[PDB]
Design a binder for this molecule. Structure first.
Ligand code: HEM
Ligand SMILES: [Ca+2]
Ligand SMILES: [Ca+2]
Length: 306
């Protein structure tokens, strides 16, 4: 059983050390909080939150960093190394990389203006990485709502509230032009833009992501408050201004009878969204953790102890 007080005696200042690291980093990289939250999500959706994503290549197993959903996309690894080193100095061989990343995600959300809460702790680190599983389990922006639901159910999150709330992670952060080119110029082989994309916003996005342009160019997930963690993400959806297909489908999919009321509830109330986000975050953070004597307390998050 994971518990929020797991380190209250062994490393009482772990959350503060993690917070300090993110605060400093945010001055040079305003995108780091979003990036870290995403790392935690990518950790939990592949064999659970066991820091498997933090492992680098070895001659026996490939790193998840080369997965389609991570390669040239996931970022912030050096920052995690930094806080891990700072925590190792404060409390040697005590805090697992899995827990560190979980705390880092929560602190990132809070620092960005989101809710503040104590995440359950006690997770341990994996002894291997899972590239194939990462390629199979990470959802793609072109997924239909049924596919998005299936992807979450696959890892243990059955509730549509889990999906709608966690999708709120797109209240900040960046997205490459490559992931919306179809919506802008040729959606579903129609030669036309995605009809669920607001036409005014369509023009704006086409200007940022011209056909035959730099597909790596970055666009804000939330046009209202690009770097603030709030419920504006949902207000955008109600106006057909969700950035990627998977965002807008929560409100426009023919299968959205159950997600629409959730989108509206979160758009109508910050408290309702924040409460749901915390509940969903803890549920995701509870996915198949290694505990007790299972796995290890990695000293270097990039490699298994030797
Ligand atoms: C529901 C399915 C989801 C899909 C299909 C999806 C898709 C994407 C895509 C395409 C990107 C852009 C990557 C890039 O341009 O390199 C991205 C970024 C991001 N996602 Fe999601 N995502 C999903 C769920 C989530 C969840 C559950 C969270 C966390 C609670 C999350 C948090 C983020 C954040 C914060 C970023 C920006 C990261 C940065 O700027 O470094 N995503 N997502
Ligand atoms: Ca993992
Ligand atoms: Ca926002």
């Amino acid at each position: 059983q994971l518990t929020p007080t797991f380190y209250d005696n062994s490393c009482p200042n772990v959350s503060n050390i993690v917070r300090d690291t993110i605060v400093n980093e945010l001055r040079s990289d305003p995108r780091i909080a979003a990036s870290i939250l995403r790392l935690h999500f990518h950790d939990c959706f592949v064999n659970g939150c066991d820091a498997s994503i933090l492992l680098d290549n070895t001659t026996s197993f490939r790193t998840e960093k080369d997965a389609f959903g991570n390669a040239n996309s996931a970022r912030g690894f050096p920052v995690i190394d930094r806080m891990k080193a700072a925590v190792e100095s404060a409390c040697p061989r005590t805090v697992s990389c899995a827990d560190l990343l979980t705390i880092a995600a929560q602190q990132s959300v809070t620092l960005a203006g989101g809710p503040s809460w104590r995440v359950p702790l006690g997770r341990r680190d994996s002894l291997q990485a899972f590239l194939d599983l990462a390629n199979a389990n990470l959802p793609a922006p072109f997924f239909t709502l049924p596919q998005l639901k299936d992807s979450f159910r696959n890892v243990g999150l059955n509730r549509s509230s889990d999906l709608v709330a966690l999708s709120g992670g797109h209240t900040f952060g960046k997205n490459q032009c490559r992931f919306i080119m179809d919506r802008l110029y040729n959606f579903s082989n129609t030669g036309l833009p995605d009809p669920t994309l607001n036409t005014t916003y369509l023009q704006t996005l086409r200007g940022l992501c011209p056909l035959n342009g730099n597909l790596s160019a970055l666009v804000d997930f939330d046009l209202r408050t690009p770097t603030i963690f709030d419920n504006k993400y949902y207000v955008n959806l109600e106006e057909q201004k969700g950035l990627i297909q998977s965002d807008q489908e929560l409100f426009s999919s023919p299968n959205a009878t159950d997600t629409i009321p959730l989108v509206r509830s979160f758009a109508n109330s910050t408290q309702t969204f924040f409460n749901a986000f915390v509940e969903a975050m803890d549920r995701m953070g509870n996915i198949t953790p290694l505990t007790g004597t299972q796995g290890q307390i990695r000293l270097n998050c990039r490699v298994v102890n030797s």
